[PDB]
Amino acid sequence: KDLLYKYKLYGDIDEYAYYFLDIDIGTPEQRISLILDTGSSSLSFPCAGCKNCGVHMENPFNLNNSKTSSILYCENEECPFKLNCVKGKCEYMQSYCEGSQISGFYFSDVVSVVSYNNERVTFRKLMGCHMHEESLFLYQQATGVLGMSLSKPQGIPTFVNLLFDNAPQLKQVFTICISENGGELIAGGYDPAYIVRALREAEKVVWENVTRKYYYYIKVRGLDMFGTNMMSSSKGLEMLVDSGSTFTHIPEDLYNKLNYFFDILCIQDMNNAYDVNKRLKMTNESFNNPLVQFDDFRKSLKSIIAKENMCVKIVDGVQCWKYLEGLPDLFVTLSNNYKMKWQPHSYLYKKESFWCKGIEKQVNNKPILGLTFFKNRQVIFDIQKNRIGFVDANCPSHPTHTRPR
Numbered sequence: 001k002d003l004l005y006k007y008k009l010y011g012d013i014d015e016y017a018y019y020f021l022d023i024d025i026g027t028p029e030q031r032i033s034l035i036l037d038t039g040s041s042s043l044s045f046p047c048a049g050c051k052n053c054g055v056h057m058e059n060p061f062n063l064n065n066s067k068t069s070s071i072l073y074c075e076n077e078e079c080p081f082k083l084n085c086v087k088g089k090c091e092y093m094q095s096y097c098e099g100s101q102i103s104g105f106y107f108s109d110v111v112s113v114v115s116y117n118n119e120r121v122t123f124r125k126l127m128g129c130h131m132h133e134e135s136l137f138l139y140q141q142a143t144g145v146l147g148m149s150l151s152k153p154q155g156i157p158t159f160v161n162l163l164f165d166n167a168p169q170l171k172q173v174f175t176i177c178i179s180e181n182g183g184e185l186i187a188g189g190y191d192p193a194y195i196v197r198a199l200r201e202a203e204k205v206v207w208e209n210v211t212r213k214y215y216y217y218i219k220v221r222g223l224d225m226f227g228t229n230m231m232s233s234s235k236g237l238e239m240l241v242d243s244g245s246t247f248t249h250i251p252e253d254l255y256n257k258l259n260y261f262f263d264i265l266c267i268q269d270m271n272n273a274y275d276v277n278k279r280l281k282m283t284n285e286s287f288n289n290p291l292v293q294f295d296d297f298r299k300s301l302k303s304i305i306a307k308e309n310m311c312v313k314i315v316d317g318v319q320c321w322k323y324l325e326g327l328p329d330l331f332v333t334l335s336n337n338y339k340m341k342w343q344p345h346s347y348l349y350k351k352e353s354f355w356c357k358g359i360e361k362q363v364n365n366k367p368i369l370g371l372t373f374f375k376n377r378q379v380i381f382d383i384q385k386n387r388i389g390f391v392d393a394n395c396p397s398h399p400t401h402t403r404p405r
């Protein structure tokens with residue numbers, strides 16, 4: 001019966017493409033919506049005075065209205081934390097892409113995290129004021145970013161470490177439970193009541209060791225479709241467990257192999273004989289990569305056709321199906337040959353009435369288990385034991401219209 005603090009998350013894959021929560025900053029409190037991002041480590045948002053910032057769901061944080069704010073000025077041009085001194089202030093600088101940056105300056109102020117059961121944790125945090133935004137930050141609704149990764153020695157103390165340092169009544173575990181609409185962040189553990197009820201093995205958390213000290217990487221040892229490992233050339237692959245990534249990003253070879261079969265399962269018109277015939281004629285020999293379970297490929301194809309599970313291709317050739325039924329499970333191979341089921345209700349996401357593929361090619365050799373891997377499971381960050389746990393779950397769902405103010 002570990003004590004759990006719970007926080008509502010809002011968002012989705014299609015419209016927001018991230019999930020966010022509300023945090024109170026300053027004195028008196030200014031409530032700010034923040035993207036929940038296990039792939040970064042800062043806490044930042046536009047501040048009043050920014051000359052090139054997007055319009056977000058809240059006004060920029062106003063330093064002049066918070067009595068507890070303290071701008072981090074340079075003392076004879078020297079900043080802590082190896083920061084750069086720019087125009088008298090210690091500079092905040094982040095590359096949202098490989099080469100492009102949000103910039104501003106650092107300040108500290110009080111942060112207050114309140115659970116929806118009215119349980120409060122408060123501390124001071126060194127935060128970034130955006131004074132220049134660009135690209136997607138000019139049209140994102142959320143006001144800032146809440147980085148959930150770990151503190152490094154001699155680095156700026158991060159939100160997650162400060163939260164637990166100031167809540168010793170909690171075990172040092174946080175869980176993210178993403179649903180199709182909204183979700184929940186849990187501090188202090190995971191909630192076994194959310195777990196979906198061989199079958200007893202699927203009701204149990206599967207744990208993987210993190211492969212880096214201060215970032216949430218795990219090693220993936222294979223990825224199966226129709227019983228066939230589609231990355232057999234690679235026998236370990238460090239993937240970032242990243243709630244700030246809309247989609248799941250995989251190596252190019254693996255993507256092309258998977259996408260080949262998803263293309264076969266994507267039929268625009270079930271009454272077009274040429275299109276249907278071409279697919280039903282394919283044999284095990286038709287494939288560059290033969291399948292170990294060709295009969296399961298056939299069952300998927302035949303049931304998609306028989307149930308008229310029509311597919312529409314949208315921008316960039318992404319496949320969208322009318323129904324989840326018929327699409328295959330994928331399996332992620334972890335330690336000790338464990339096959340973690342990755343279901344269509346996770347890797348496909350809701351777009352209008354259809355279910356669209358949420359798997360993409362990596363860029364810059366950055367493979368990512370993103371929100372289409374989080375969806376409909378508890379993802380459990382045990383920072384005490386440096387492990388991440390996974391279990392299928394019925395996550396809380398919160399429409400954005402339920403968000404106060």
Ligand SMILES: CN1C(=N)N[C@@]2(c3cc(F)ccc3F)CN(c3ncccc3-c3ccc(Cl)cc3)C[C@H]2C1=O
Binds near residue numbers: 037042097
């Ligand atoms: C996958 N993915 C993330 N997981 N997160 C980022 C992000 C998530 C999101 F939901 C919306 C917009 C985004 F920029 C923030 N990124 C950073 N990557 C490394 C270090 C710092 C940042 C960063 C950049 C800008 C700010 Cl102000 C704060 C932090 C990289 C970018 C990204 O592509």
Ligand SMILES: *[C@@H]1O[C@H](CO)[C@@H](O[C@@H]2O[C@H](CO)[C@@H](O)[C@H](O)[C@H]2NC(C)=O)[C@H](O)[C@H]1NC(C)=O
Binds near residue numbers: 209335
């Ligand atoms: C994951 O990490 C844990 C923790 O380091 C490993 O368990 C340790 O294993 C060593 C040697 O087997 C023992 O001396 C330690 O006492 C163990 N630690 C704990 C806390 O039990 C575990 O082996 C790792 N898992 C894999 C698959 O490598």
Ligand SMILES: *[C@@H]1O[C@H](CO)[C@@H](O)[C@H](O)[C@H]1NC(C)=O
Binds near residue numbers: 048049
């Ligand atoms: C805050 O107040 C200071 C001094 O009163 C002023 O220099 C600064 O421009 C103010 N900031 C904004 C955003 O108005």
Ligand SMILES: *[C@@H]1O[C@H](CO)[C@@H](O)[C@H](O)[C@H]1NC(C)=O
Binds near residue numbers: 295
């Ligand atoms: C398809 O071919 C592969 C070749 O590696 C084989 O392993 C598999 O059993 C075959 N399945 C059939 C013929 O149904």
